[PDB]
Ligand binder design. Structure first.
Ligand SMILES: Nc1ncnc2c1ncn2[C@@H]1O[C@H](CSCC[C@H](N)C(=O)O)[C@@H](O)[C@H]1O
Ligand SMILES: Nc1ncnc2c1ncn2[C@@H]1O[C@H](CSCC[C@H](N)C(=O)O)[C@@H](O)[C@H]1O
Ligand SMILES: Nc1ncnc2c1ncn2[C@@H]1O[C@H](CSCC[C@H](N)C(=O)O)[C@@H](O)[C@H]1O
Ligand SMILES: Nc1ncnc2c1ncn2[C@@H]1O[C@H](CSCC[C@H](N)C(=O)O)[C@@H](O)[C@H]1O
Lengths: 252, 252, 252, 252
């Protein structure tokens, strides 16, 4: 989505951030872009399955200085330091795309989440930033299901029917499982579509908790700001952001 | 809970019931009772592991003319009919112990629960009682946790630790997986005890849904009365029940 | 085999054995028998499923004093001592039907086996008997295949196939998995029978190894002997047995 | 292997092979060599993990024009045809390193075998060459034990034990699973080494079968010849090889 792209860059540039570390390189979608707009991007992910693809584009677009100056290393927020040489601290550390909602709280104690963020944020240098984003589960929870479609991050052209299955654990949301029933265009007889599905689970983080979770990472020395979809967020605000974007100005 | 015993026995007598089909023998607890109580008790359960134990009680007291008659059989509510031929139906069909909750909503809709209940009622000869029962899920779904230890149904002697993990499919409380950890009076070392656990899931049956579900099965001709634990029960009261006992007098 | 029943009863009665412990009750065929013959028998088996099918005949024939004394309890050759108090001892402990072979050597060393044999021999009273047998896994070692329907115990009327997976660890036969492809003559449309299977895995056992392993169970004190099938066996003999039978007269 | 490498190049060379397809690119050891060696390499493996490492080297050496030409890709033999545009056919096609002995016969009939060899063979242009190798399983099988240390391919400086596990189905050698308990020079206390095993499963291919199986995919239209280790191998020859090397001059 144009807006998205716009928002991102404008922020990276509105701070002076040029050196960036992606902690969810995935397919390389956003990193690749950043690599175009002239950024020093070092992207990483823990899943080769995805990384391999990002790595793909590069080799091809290898006949371009921009793409020859791009990194892609595997890593896990659970040891981001051990896997990524922070140096003095990347200008901006970006983790947009509700990537963090993939970290399931295994131990029951949100020990997994603190640690992850701890390492993630650490890589940000003084006067640094962190574009960590998560879906609006506060609502998803209060709704009972997950409203698909409006990907303020991308204008999805494919349609699929979602089936939301939340799982309370001792009264605390422990996970949200989205069951996508994709309706591929043509996969039948006289042209009719085919029905192929896939599902994935995440953690139902709620603004409140994440906000506190995030600061806790920067040891406190930081500037916190949260945008509803892509614009600032004001409690009890007429709107209803699909996404929640938390940006951190590591100050100390 | 001795009390429990008194009330039920009476209802049975006050209504001149003798032949009693127990659609949930479990370990034999109730049947054993009616047994001694002097009732032609034909108890059946769907579990080999459980029945195994009610059977044992029989062999031992096989010497007792009473128990020699008692009859435990395998069977499933989902097919009771074929598995249990009730000549002209029985006098009292009990389903005590929150056993009916175990029946999971596989197909999504409550179709399964239909056949189950549907079949159970059929086991009641016109002018016959039934005592199905379910944990107060209305209140349980608000506390999102299952209070263990006491069950007015009886008083065992096993201290347990529980972990209530509820599930919500598209906002509808689908399942409720309770994880127990029973303390074994002897499993440590120097007298120390053991701690062996297991896990059972149930279907959160709200008083509402069930009363309608149950009567449904009787096609209509019947008398319904739901007592909280075991005393009368009228909506929005001061007392909070842990178990809702549904007593029915099929009349057609 | 009426000839193998005549010998079993002959040997037992011959040595004056009344008390007999079937350490492999199973459905209880072999045990059930001894019972009818006015023999005092306690029957134990490690498998509920099977044991229970015997427990059944007891209730049924419970109307016969004999079965009113017949016993059955779950038990494992590995914890025998604790599951079955031997008291003074049993006159004749039997382990027919290639049951023992079902104990796998998980640990690698016959340790498990020694404990098994050891525990069973501890159920015999000085001047005792033990009828443990084992299929002729010696020839099967040179034929890498086990032919079905050769039981010299009960006429098998269930047509079935079999696939033999002989495992060999470090040149030492370690396992033998027989995948039974039974047929259900009636599982079909116009009478046609259906087809499926169940798995059964046993540890091989060539005469030598077992001939010694077993004596050790009594540790010398014993008059051991092994009939080819049910007749006197002789190494380098003509008739190739198929069921070696070790009879033990604990002497000490 | 000083020897290995030697023979190869020469062979390839003498035949005049330029473009080579490695159907088992693994970590890309032989691919990277031929690359440097000045050969038009197109290598592929069916395993991300493996491949992903060959890819890495290429990215680093990406500078040197050689690796710039290299062509690592994903692909599985079973469908190698619709995975690699045979084009005008390759000059040489290597499948060395006991890689083929990895493809199992889940189907029961070595069908999946004949096909893989077939598709692979299809990547060989007329006057072509095929270098498919495999362990001397004849010996292992006939000896029930797989010898450790004789890796003619590359002198292994490792100290791990080997537990050869041959599996049998209906009298046919279905699988050979070796357990290599490799010893980490340093994993103990006082500078001691540690221990960690790892078992792998290969299909016990015997020369007779293989030799047959190979020319088939060819259709008798070739010139087959198998080396002992790297020298002429004749039946009965006192020397017991370890790696049979089949070379095919697909002459058709
Ligand atoms: N513990 C963790 N640390 C770092 N990366 C992780 C991770 N857990 C999951 N990931 C990876 O992050 C990726 C999912 S993020 C999905 C959104 C995607 N990046 C987008 O732009 O639309 C996967 O490749 C997953 O392997
Ligand atoms: N669908 C079904 N049909 C018949 N019996 C069932 C059943 N679902 C559950 N049950 C039975 O419910 C019985 C007792 S209720 C479960 C409680 C358990 N016996 C305890 O001691 O804690 C079990 O024997 C179980 O097999
Ligand atoms: N560890 C063990 N301890 C006790 N019984 C065992 C055992 N391992 C296997 N068994 C039992 O071996 C039994 C009999 S095997 C076949 C028995 C058959 N009815 C006959 O003709 O004798 C099975 O019931 C199985 O439960
Ligand atoms: N079905 C198949 N298709 C393609 N490649 C295969 C294959 N089965 C296994 N392989 C691959 O071959 C490699 C193992 S064989 C390489 C072993 C070599 N001797 C060494 O020690 O270096 C792995 O990449 C595996 O993924």
């Amino acid at each position: 989505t144009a807006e998205y792209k716009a928002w991102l860059l404008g922020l990276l540039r509105q701070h002076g951030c040029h050196r960036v570390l992606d902690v969810a390189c995935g397919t390389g979608v956003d990193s690749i872009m950043l690599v175009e707009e002239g950024f020093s991007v070092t992207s990483v992910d823990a899943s080769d399955k995805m990384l391999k693809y990002a790595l793909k584009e590069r080799w091809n677009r290898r006949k371009e200085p921009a793409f020859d100056k791009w990194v892609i290393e595997e890593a896990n927020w659970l040891t981001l330091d051990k896997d990524v040489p922070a140096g003095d601290g990347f200008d901006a550390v970006i983790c947009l795309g509700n990537s963090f909602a993939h970290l399931p709280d295994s131990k029951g104690d949100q020990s997994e989440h603190r640690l992850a963020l701890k390492n993630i944020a650490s890589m940000v240098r003084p006067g640094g930033l962190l574009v960590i984003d998560h879906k609006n589960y506060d609502y998803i929870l209060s709704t009972g299901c997950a409203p698909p479609g409006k990907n303020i991050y991308y204008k999805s052209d494919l349609t699929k029917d979602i089936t939301t299955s939340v799982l309370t654990v001792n009264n605390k949301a422990h996970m949200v499982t989205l069951d996508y029933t994709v309706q591929v265009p043509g996969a039948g007889r006289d042209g009719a579509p085919g029905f192929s599905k896939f599902r994935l689970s995440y953690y139902p983080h709620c603004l409140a908790s994440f906000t506190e979770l995030v600061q806790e990472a920067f040891g406190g020395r930081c500037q916190h700001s949260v945008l509803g979809d892509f614009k600032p967020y004001r409690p009890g605000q007429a709107y209803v952001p699909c996404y929640f974007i938390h940006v951190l100005k590591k100050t100390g």
